[model samples]
Target: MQIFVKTLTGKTITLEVEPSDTIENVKAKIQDKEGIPPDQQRLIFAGKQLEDGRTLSDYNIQKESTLHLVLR
Candidate 1:
């Protein structure tokens, strides 16, 4: 599935992740794409943290779901 991730720099990136991928994996992918470290990253989905190790299905993330990334 494809997921949309917006960065603090106002850049939006779309990533293709497998159904079995966990939130942590997504975070790592974001880090890879944006060059941001996991420790300095905050991922909010529907205004909440995309908690570590939780699958997209666990969070009910479907197509077109938006995720905001705030750098700290």
Candidate 2:
């Protein structure tokens, strides 16, 4: 499945992901493609903040879901 990460500026990136992948893993992939380190990234979905250890399935994130990404 695939997911999207969108920034406040309206820039977005597509990420190929699996429901079993952890949020931490996703952050790493984001860094790999976007150069933003995990420690500086925060992911939000369905008005909830995603935890590093939690899997996408835990949040019930579906294919083509868009996750808001914040840099801090």
Candidate 3:
């Protein structure tokens, strides 16, 4: 499924992920795409901060879901 991720400044990107992928995995992909380390990226979905071990499906984040992203 494709997911939408937006930066704090409104820059957004799309990612292709499987439901089984953990939030950590997505972070890795984001790290690759944006040149931000996984440790530096923050991902939020449904007004909740996403944890590394949580699966996308566990959070009911389906295709096209938007994850607001920020970096420290």
Candidate 4:
């Protein structure tokens, strides 16, 4: 339902995340919501790279948790 986005913006934002959403799709949401691009986005969930070609549920991101999102 929710995920923590800790970026280099000096602030952390909790976002609505769906299990069915792919990492790329979430990157789009981050683009729209946080103004970070997919290319510049490096998402890490549970210390693993939340890269392309995988859904949030596939990575067991069901419960609300903190995920790292870094922008270059």
Which residue pairs does candidate 4 place in steric collision? Answer: none
lDDT of 4 at 57: 86
- Model 4 Cα displacement at 21 (Å)? 0.2
Instruction: For candidate 4, give the lDDT of residue 70.
Output: 73
lDDT scores in order: 0.81, 0.92, 0.88, 0.80
Candidate 4 structure quality by residue, lDDT tens digits, 1-72: 887778656688878778898989888888889676787888887678786899888887775777788776
For model 2, residues 1-72, the per-residue Cα lDDT tens digits are 899999999998998889999999899999999999998999999788898989999888888989999898
Candidate 4: regions farther than 4 A off: 8-10
List clash counts for every candidate, in order: 0, 0, 0, 0
Which digits, one per residue and each the tens of the lDDT, describe model 1 over residues 1-72?
888988777888898886678877787888787677887887898778878878887888877688898887
Candidate 1 worst ten-residue window by lDDT: 18-27
Error of 2 at 1 (Å): 1.6
Compose the digit string of candidate 3's lDDT tens values, residues 1-72: 899889888798998889999998899998888787888888987788899989999888878889999787
